[PDB]
Subunit: 160 residues, 12 copies
């Protein structure tokens, strides 16, 4: 009646520009998760425990985020690259330093790393939204969740 | 290496107008929560239990909503005010009456007050979206959820 | 002071007839997909039967939650859904699922095509829906995301090298 | 010792008459689930919520029932048909009407639809039991569960 | 279209004898529940805890059973009577004694009273099955469950 | 062993026969309420059936937990409960529940009355129980609170304002 | 029907206006504490933010459960609660919570004070409530116990030993 | 009045020796199937290994619950089960499962055959069991249903077009 | 700010040293009971071992929750608990638990006695505690109820009727 | 950098002697589970329930143990044999007797069967540890869990 | 048949020295549990909540540990003594002070007492392992868990 | 008497630099495996896609729990882990996972090889780790066990007859 008369109906394909934009998001989410864990292990000093715990919650969110983005790429037949060499070579996040770091330092360092990750998402959002609003909605959820983490972490160092 | 150089990368900040718009949403969500509980306790008459129970679901949603908005304000460096004096003085919701009220009256009263709350959100949504799409998505979820509540409550009084 | 409104009767958002019809289009294709998803679920046989059998139930679960979401969104906005069998069969845009057993390979291709068709319906109304009501467009986008994920998880069985 | 000495032992095969009898059950269970959802969405008026909720419980039972029957057919190497065209063309259930319907009307309509579904099962039960008691036990469980739903729904309109 | 024409399709109705048979089952299940709790509270002596706990499991099963039968009666348009006066006056179970009782005595007493309850169900099962096989299946589940309880309780007193 | 007691046999708190008798009064009315609640649960018909049907089970659940609590409190205090059908029928203060199907409106009034009777039994006994054993009065107070909540949740159906 | 009462209408325990008024005092302070707790929850900044942020939600959870408990206890006893914003603002005894971001140290002192004010309201009312209805006093005592625990868990942050 | 029975010793249902032997036949085949199911679970290799590996554990779970059910039903009816290794090996009707690794395709065929054999045993005693005790026949029918579902979920891997 | 208090510092309810001392008596006996319960849990042997082994853990669970409750109630009221081993040993009123394996019959009598001693400590203190702070007496009453239940569930093993 | 330059890297392979040592453990764990169930069904007399329940806990542990061992064999490319004929022919456990057995007898019989199973594990532990410490750790966990079960069961018959 | 002949097979028995070694571990675990609760209640000051909560986690682990050791003793026919008098008289842990203590002091005190407990376990581990490797594995789990607790607690006081 | 130690500062176990370096080797290979595991998880296509897709997430979960365990064990023993991307890429012994889509068959072989490499690292340090600290060796052995199980569950797809 209103049934389409075709046996091969094409799905929505992402352009390579689109795929590349999500690839930028992906590497930063992965880097953030790797840096978050480094901080989680090596944070020491006043209010260690809270930061130790909040950092795991950040890592959980970023890990779920990176899976979401990579699988959205695959859904649109783009192909993600989350390999270590690629992440190290292409991430926009400032390097996390080595060794034990005080809670105060870790708060400042991680807040910056989150903000860099959010910046990447905000930078590609318009171009992503223009091609596929559904992907932009996922990016928006990441912005929301990550900016929450930044507030929850940075507030420790806030003086009023 | 594509790593950024900055030691301190700042996060997205909301304009005063943006903060003010979310504050408007916040007071109406809190007011709806308080009126919802008032109705939950004081409703009597035909089909009491159904409305008693549904009103608790409305309250739960409005409370989660008010927390989400206030914490979105915090993330974007805005400062929420959810104090009783502020809510009473600035809420746009028509006052909920005191004392026992019939089920049919509660249905009409609460439907009106939900719709008032949705109106507030709908009226700020374009300006919010223009500045920050991620926050607009949160507002949209509230519109969806509250309008569902309105339908579930108001249907009790529907004619034919 | 007081910023309280005075009206005793404040009205809710009402969808236009066009908006309701657009969501109705989404509804029937979601239901048809659920019905076809189960048909495939029961009737698939062959290499890697179990994975597809299981994955198809996940598709049906998502499509069922989606149709309830759209139908209830219609109700919220004073529109009236029609999910009856006769209406679905008469108005769905999905090619009919064939009868009897189908090979795993064929089910993969068939169901992928039907998901693609269901998503195409949603993508085709999304602009018009977003223009009238952004909140509803968000629900549509959630459906697009979830369905296209199902399409990937199913179709990849047949993709080579 | 008592081990059977055959590498290919045949399972129990359903006759085509048996398969056709379960196919009759299947289409009615599916139709009932589709009608149940229609009622669930479009019911309005006094005691909306209870009926709204009970209708979802009916749909849940009928959906689980249809999966049970279709998979029992497959187990016995019959092949079910639950496609929309087939269901519409072969269901014995009276058509559910369009548009919003009052709770009182919905109670009466749905009770009849359940009773029709139960009738189909009761009508084939003897013939099914004669070939395969195990399938008849499943049919009996459906009779029990559906007749419970009919009582739970119809009681709303019962005047004593 | 194979759709039926009838606007009102009636459900299966039980005969008075059928209703009476299920009523017999109901009073004995309720009586067993009350006696089970009595035993649960008042048992003392060797292996108290095991019997204390097992008796609660018996009660749970009997209560679920009594609810199932009474609601099966309702579904088939019969009217259950589970009131205390009716149960006392019409139960076939030998009276459970008052006051503290040894574990060994409770084992013997409860086993006898379970067996009495099963006897009632077994005695009505053929007549129930003849009229409605689905109800007989429910009775069969009760026979299975209660006879399991009898074994689990009585084994405490077994000789060699 | 500085402050340790050297007693081989230390006995527990023993309830008086008056106290035992007072808990027995509460027990039979809780059991009778449970039986009447289920009777109402099964046989209630008419307007708003489902809500009442469901609420009546919640009442029965609470009454059943209460009877077990009181009975085992008796046992702990060396008293002996009697919850047998004959005893409950012969000694309950609750008005008899009628036979047959009863309308939702009638069931609301009937059950509210029987809850209030049960609560009255507990309230009339509470002073004497508290005077001997405050811990048991606390249990009684929990039952009062819970049952009076049930009464409100049931009776509100029939309210006209 | 040996001991059965023959009354058709048995009424429940009815709260006096004094009792109703006393529960209302508790209600508004519990609601005000809930609103102030959330304000603190959102706006607290500085040393040990997360612990306080989290503990403040636990406080709010308990205060919200308390207000519902008291309000519904009023309803059960035929009293009528008023938890509306205007009433709470106009009648609460709690000192006003300040606006803007506040340090963890200040929030600790502020919230401890407001908890103690809430507890004081309950303690000042408890004797009169107990005298009329011991069951309701038990509920009040639960609130005292829970809130005083919250006060300890919050104030200990600022302790210097 | 009173309809109470007078006997202090009321006996339970006793199974005939034939009935016990029939359930014993079911028992050993269920245990053998469980043992063979695990063997296949560990030793299957090849195309679609994981699905079959997983599905075989589901088969074993069902067969294990089934053997416990039948054995305990025997005990309830004063019969005595024998599930010892020697008895199982000496009396099972199932063809022995071969040793060492088997291909996925072979495991599908082998296990399907063994399920078919297990179900055949149950179907062969079902009439005689139902004649003596309908309640036990219902348990057998549950086993028939569950096992034949497992057979379908496993065998469909090898079914073509 | 109509009824709002303007006090910057509002202090909480402060326990007297007598009250603190009374809760300390309860604390050490609860801890001693916990340690003795575990000793019995490990070393009990003989007829009905498992039931007693299991019940003893339930006792210990309740006693441990009780000690934490009382200790934190002290903290809330500005009292300071001491649950250290030396203090518990030096100040407990419980008769010493013997060393080595002990029969189930002996463990029943031993543990019942030690529960009753613990309950006696609480009962002897309850009037004074209630007089100063009813909320804390409610906690004590919960402990009485729970421990006396444990005593019944344990001692019933050795009963001869 | 430190990346190994090989596309085919071999895993750790168990020797046939190792595989045979685990095969000895496997058959005894399986026999124990079969004997445990036999006891679970046929135990009667004083403290029936406790033993009935503890025997199921033993069977649960032994079943999980046998899966663990067989899957460890497979992991190291050994091939387990848990077939009935093999178990009966190669188990070191004394045969469990037929018919109903008293709780006292069942306690003694099962304790011995557990001790035999533990003996087998202890006997192969050194040889297993010498080739693969990770497998020896699994064996040690079985020793711990089984010896706990032996204590929990035997204590019933212990006279002091 | 490879079945063993013995009707009574004995289980592994521990030496007196072995029993004595586990007793040493037991008293220190119990002492750590009591001191942990003492600290949990009486800690005050900066970052109270984190330490309050972490100390409960330490207590939970130590209690599970003490139960595991005592029950391992029972399994191997040793007799644990966890009575208050014995613990006080034989524990190697430095006495925990009475009264309120600052967070920083509690961190230092508890770290020292955890380390004392670990020292006891480490000092008996070789002798335990030599006699029974399975018990040494249990000790190793305690070493792992407690040293994790030590790190999580002590990090609060770490300098840079 | 008293066996209590006197020191106010008792030190914990400190790992040697060699020991820390050995655990660092394990750490980077576990992280690399997690990263490669996800890459394969997203990019695998072909026959039996779904099973491998799912099984690879289970591998990643285990590898992630393992890296956190080793890193935290390092911290417990006063060693300092480095799990940063640059370090992992520069020091991992795993062959790099290739880019873009790979067939199911290829992913099976590739990932099996990488697990084998990860386990080889652990096996190579196990003796030295066990010599200094048996407790850490136990954690390594748990990793060996879990990873080799994953290798079997993955590799068996490609094993023939
Ligand atoms: Cl409801
Ligand atoms: Cl926390
Ligand atoms: Cl799967
Ligand atoms: Cl138990
Ligand atoms: Fe995933
Ligand atoms: Fe929050
Ligand atoms: Fe719904
Ligand atoms: Fe299914
Ligand atoms: Fe029910
Ligand atoms: Fe109980
Ligand atoms: Fe409520
Ligand atoms: Fe069992
Ligand atoms: Fe605590
Ligand atoms: Fe497994
Ligand atoms: Fe234990
Ligand atoms: Fe962690
Ligand atoms: Mg903190
Ligand atoms: Mg597969
Ligand atoms: Mg209703
Ligand atoms: Mg026992």
């Amino acid at each position: 009646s209103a049934r389409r008369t075709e046996s091969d109906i094409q799905g929505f394909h992402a352009t390579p520009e689109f795929g590349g934009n999500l690839q930028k998001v992906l590497v930063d989410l992965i880097e953030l998760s790797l840096q978050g864990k480094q901080a989680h292990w090596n944070v020491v000093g006043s209010n260690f425990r809270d930061l130790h715990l909040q950092l795991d919650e950040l890592v959980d969110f970023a890990r779920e985020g990176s899976d979401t983005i990579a699988e959205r790429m695959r859904a649109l037949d783009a192909v993600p690259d989350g390999r270590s060499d690629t992440v190290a070579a292409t991430t926009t996040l400032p390097e996390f330093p080595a060794f034990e770091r005080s809670t105060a330092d870790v708060v400042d360092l991680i807040t910056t790393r989150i903000n860099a990750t959010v910046d990447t998402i905000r930078r590609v959002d318009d171009a992503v939204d223009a091609e596929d609003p559904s992907t932009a909605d996922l990016l928006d959820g990441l912005i929301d969740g990550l900016e929450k983490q930044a507030w929850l972490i940075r507030s420790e160092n806030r003086k009023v």
